[model samples]
Target: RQIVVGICSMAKKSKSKPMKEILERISLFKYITVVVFEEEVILNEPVENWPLCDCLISFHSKGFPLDKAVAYAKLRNPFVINDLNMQYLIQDRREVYSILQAEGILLPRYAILNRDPNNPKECNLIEGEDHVEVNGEVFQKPFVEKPVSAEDHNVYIYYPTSAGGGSQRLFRKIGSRSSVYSPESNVRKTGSYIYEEFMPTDGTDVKVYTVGPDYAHAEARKSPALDGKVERDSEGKEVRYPVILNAREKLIAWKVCLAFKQTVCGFDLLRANGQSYVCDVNGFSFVKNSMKYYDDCAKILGNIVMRELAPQFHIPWSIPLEAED
Candidate 1:
């Protein structure tokens, strides 16, 4: 079936291995047209000239200069929509946590140290130190720090409390200073970092993908438990490595995905001290390839387009051929 879905990716081409999988799978759905919509980098060509599609999928959440493309997409396609409900957050971290808590979901123990009660701080305080309990061994780090607003693709790390691996991100530090002058640097930079009690986990994190209220797929990404850095894929290469999730984990992952109401969303489930919590919710996620799922991503996307384009349209062509009476 031919489905029209527009794509907004960081690049027409990228060095990331996952991205390579996406480009290849997208090409399989030859009937489906892909559009380039990276607004952060200047494009001399006008958007109106680009071909039209039934729906637009934004791959770049913040760094893609989405504000401009989003406005253009909404104006051009009646079916256009933003995935994360980012508008709900005054565009900050604290609001995101509040909304999640208000929705009655479980989250990590945390505190707002930088004068903003809205963001979720990381680098949890040791138990009996400064952190409080959220029904688990997790405790707030006497303090934690992160870019209040990480828009420039700054590397962020979430290491296991067990400290098995080295630091995950190239740019992240576990005990970095919380720059107070950041707020005074510019009113726009007033977004502050979060200090959170580290959530205990067993090193493996479950990622559950939900599409339109149904669990689509699930995977488990395990950190080295000790927080070691994983190798990155050089630009323009294809590689596949095993990341396993068993049946028990899959069931739990499905439950987590079902809890969210968004049409498209992904959850990061963490395990600590034999307990688990949904740590992160990514609004727009992609399956670069289906080698793990045993198929191609375009096929998965085609099914979504069908459901989105016409949820109630069922072909009764072979059904008893009922006639209007």
Candidate 2:
């Protein structure tokens, strides 16, 4: 193995969603060396103390020191799987949605509360009003309110009184439960959040996972909003049915990877009203427990990493950035 491929993540994350199969497959390539950071002590080692990798694959998860990883990348200048620059933005909803918008990707109408830090205004939530407001532009009723931080799974959905007014609170999956119904239909005033026009998609939540820009796999599961029931497999992983993507969605999956600079990416799609919307975009995620997928990823990634780190044969790489058309 001539090329060093370094991989790291939180121990909790790696244990639950084991990528050992993928690791093994990638390690088979004679030109690629796979190194796993097994210690969960959480990134106290100096950046210079780490191995000199040709490419690094990592993600930000609980206890994963992404900031330090970013520092390491800055110093080492190794080829990164998911761009460290984009990782920070992925943690905020406003940044994610804007990227989708820039790509002309269809998405639910969204507005951020207190978008500016200097002006500390609030989103208005009147009991009698069917719609909510920010600074007091009225946002539509039956909207989904999400935290700016992607790590926080807690979300809220406010419905108009005419539509049987109550709210649903979504949180991290717990013992086959994903949400709880509440009588309150107002948004929480705890922190900055992004509001989206909740497109009711018959409870179908489509999740798309990409190996590269060219290959993608999609799966759909019932949204927790329909009912609090969370389907689980024998291994307690969320059970989702595989789905085929249409032409537009396939294009969207391509655009997502290219735009985010994350070859392996996962994002939520909302299929409703004859339109599919990019509801959320996450970095360095893959379909779980699929050895076939692992094999595919290993091969594809091996090729991609090598292609990206090609030996001194190409023209100056800086010029390619100038071509937009």
Candidate 3:
């Protein structure tokens, strides 16, 4: 069926490899209109000129108020990739972990430290306490520290090696130095910081992508940072390969994808000592090898548009309508 799909992205560059491949795959359908939007289109153009479509697909999260624009588009109730609530939930690193843990999904032991002690909504270390604990379990040293919000770029690992190890101030920084720690650094502060037990992977990280709750693909890649540089294969290509997940790992990926309610999202999984834990979840990801599943992704997105635009005869197959909420 012919349909219009609006591409609401604020990226300076209009096209990417994955974006082009998906469009080419879906173009097999005749008369498909693909509207592209950049930063100026939203800031300078009249809303009346905005292209209408049966559904919208968005990319990137760092710049632009895409959330507000998407919310406005929802007035027409079109099929949206990573709806507003899903975006907010993914942006909030702390809240996502809490929700997933409450649902019995395995997560790393974690605690929150506020950037400012005066912020009422921020989580703070207890007065006179050198360590933080949650649900009666204390977070040990040699852990990973990152922003409570996903947008921040700084991440570090702390190790306690000096004298008086019990003192929290005795910790030493050994990984990924950043200017954000300096008082004069211009990076905006996140309300809080997240600290979680660091799990040492078996030299590889697993990435799983899900389209709706039904279709999933997994890949294993060398860690993004190895010895302070992007790891590459001997032939100089970036290290990535398709991998098969164990039965249990596959089940966990499905649960996370459904719980987050993202139609085109991916998650990072790390396994240590034979136990798997989810480290990150991202919405509307452009997987490294997305073209491998090009046809399937296009079909799933087309089906979603049909269900929303022609509900009378449309039947939801991959995700049950009652569970989409």
Candidate 4:
């Protein structure tokens, strides 16, 4: 009997590399196999023709039909990693924050500026022309503004006159600058944005990547607010250094893992006034270059797939397989 781990994603996706690296290690196991599907063909072909996998690693990304992927997965019902059932929650800023709060994770006081008109259940209004209000808690100047859609990475930090009366616009890295400073003081009202109290992090931001509830890797990088300078390595990627997380932060990381069902997850943390706040949660994140982290991820994922599929492997190979087909 073989344990098949299927990676259903776009092959051209660069982020697929690190994931493939981890699965290859699991494939190294004597009795396991790893499978991959082209992004377009996953649902294009008859679901019955798809490979028989014990585990499926599928995550949402640009140009991929996440909802359809989840629907298709239901037809197969493998042990899905980064289970898409819960993946949609993290795609919305308000939904993500709601989950974190329910888990008792500390977060920077935040409120939705222009509430989602589509989600009738969450038509929350907590904004103003110059400030944001959250349950009578008002956040004045220097607050952070982010989109309700997690896919939108354009984050802005409006500063008061004392800090130079400008705003820092953070976007994907390019042109050796990860962000740009503009004199625009008004927040974008075109779409829903989450207005949050900005916590000064001493010119650095903490990134914590969790392989499981028990294993988390932390790193630090220059915050985009301290000028728009982008630090890069030889590979032209942003530079970051490993950092240590205290007991409390570690506990938060575990909580995040359990809450999101993303055994491999990444989240942004803010440390101000000796208290840590989780600002963002990335569903499936990886460390760029750490043999130790990679090993731990592979080991943990391998064990998860094995433990879940081992019981079935115990049955006869000729046994009529699967609940469907």
Candidate 5:
């Protein structure tokens, strides 16, 4: 392949997950290149000793113009799958819902806006009548509140904060009245909030990941019963994350990709009423864990990158990143 296969992770903690397995698997293909992008601005290491890479496979992160990140990759004349720039265009809760629906796909009924109207100071929710109205109807009074920016914000998937998203749980079982919809909470600092229908089916959520144009992998996130109370570590522990996907789930995620023409992406599916609903679609999700199936992530990544960059020999897909694994 012409491009190097590099993996990007912002937090040092996530970098450690499955690195060994990834190295072991890629080593099987001696010519392929692999690398990790910490993407920190403060210079975590010297520039001369920086990790070297050809093509970058971005992981979930919380900050950046995103548009610039994608542009930078193209300027380097490298092939980058899951470009953050393209992701930005469809990176909005409402946008995803619209695109999917327009393509005859199903997704969760949530709302997004530019600001929040009720007690504006209390929460900085975007002001959108449709969002507010849909939220009230689908989620009822008490439900889960997340950022509509998940589509735009690279790492908003973690919900409360992107720094340590794995540890942030989504469900908090309380009296219906105790449910809070603070879109602009002090926690948000400032952004828009989205109230999602509480699946309440199970704390289990599904993450469907795709590499290149078609190869895909899926995992069920079986956390504690209280969706909001479950705690997780950097590697997605304290979380029963498993690799499994039903035909229906896979089809839904695939449809999401087709809707936006995302070559590499992941979709978070919520199960409610015996059906699956798309909650989020992500680019370059940093899914790491066990090896038996090598669904472990390395295998999935290897297969995809090699396929995508096979034509660009100058950027061989089998090489390691800045620091060799």
Candidate 6:
């Protein structure tokens, strides 16, 4: 029987890009379906008929309501790329960092800035009580401010008094041209903001994307926001240079997958003081501009499908089962 793969994304129907490339590349298998829906559509269906395939791949991120569908997929157990719980946990950087830290994972010093509307407004910038504090420690300058939720992209690195700090401004803007902070910027006004100690990276950062249980592909790039320049090829595309993960780094990434019980994911590592610090864990991430990783991911995914649906058929990409002792 041909392997059937189901694909979905939180992106708009007209704007969805990665799913098509993934499907095209994974054509090595057969019978693929795209389960397109609106946010309300996911809540409208019963789990029993949410749609099924031999395996399912989801690109759901923060600010999307695919939770119900993902939950149903987990119940059915069809080789889900990233299960629901993992998505929710990764969506909140503060909580995920805390959990990883408890697991003895090396990470940067961080705190959560709780914004309360009832608190007295003392700061001159932003709205609502701008008196930001985390665990009784007031936020200091030369730190990074990230939205607790990944869906919110109003991330900024603040260097107070750098430009005579007044009226508020982004330390460095990435992926956007404007530096204005809007009242409706989607950052949780009542929720919280992740205030992290800005670790020096020498203007470079590492991103590792994992496909299967232990297989990972890593690359290091000059940070766009911090470095202010992304090296591009003659074609005007961003350059990605491959890097190898040491034993300890590999162990950390593997432990993270196990801790979160997720298969398809990625993490960012920043080096400071000769130590690697995990800065972020991304759920259901896609590797761009890398055909090698794409093919490798597809093959690994195929092996997963085979192990689940057609165990009798052997493939070179299948993960070897341990011999009975």
Query: lDDT for every model?
Result: 0.46, 0.79, 0.63, 0.78, 0.53, 0.63
lDDT of 2: 0.79
Compare candidates 3 and 4 on TM-score and give the better one.
Answer: 4
In order of lDDT, best first, we have 2, 4, 6, 3, 5, 1
lDDT of 1 by residue, 1-325 (tens): 4446665545543435655565456656545555544444324435565556667665444345545555656667635423523532424555655655665556666554353445434333233423333324453332233454433223233333353312233233223221111111111123444445555565555666554443456655444333443323576323334444445455544444444334445666666665555555655555555564324344454455544564434422221221110
> Where does model 4 exceed 4 Å of error?
115-137, 234-237, 315-325
Candidate 1: what lDDT?
0.46
- lDDT of each residue in 230-314, candidate 5, tens digit only: 4456874555566565677666666766666565566777777878887667665544554543443455556556666665554
2 versus 5: better TM-score goes to: 2
**Which candidate, 1 or 6, has the higher TM-score?**
6
Q: Candidate 1 at 42: error in angstroms?
A: 7.3
- Candidate 4 lDDT at 117 equals 60
Error of 6 at 80 (Å): 2.3
Q: Of models 1 and 3, which has the larger lDDT?
A: 3
lDDT of each residue in 126-243, candidate 2, tens digit only: 3245687654546778888898888888888888878898899999888889999998866675678887788979787999988878788888998987777898889877888878
Looking at model 2, report the run of 10 residues with the lowest lDDT sum.
316-325
**Cα lDDT for residue 204, candidate 5:** 74
- The TM-score between candidate 3 and the true structure equals 0.76
Candidate 1: Cα lDDT at 19: 51
Best of the two (1, 3) by TM-score: 3
lDDT of 5: 0.53
Q: Candidate 5: misplaced stretches above 4 Å?
A: 1-3, 8-14, 37-54, 63-68, 89-91, 116-139, 142-144, 151-191, 212-215, 222-243, 258-264, 293-296, 311-325
Q: Cα lDDT for residue 263, model 6?
A: 78
Maximum-TM-score candidate: 2
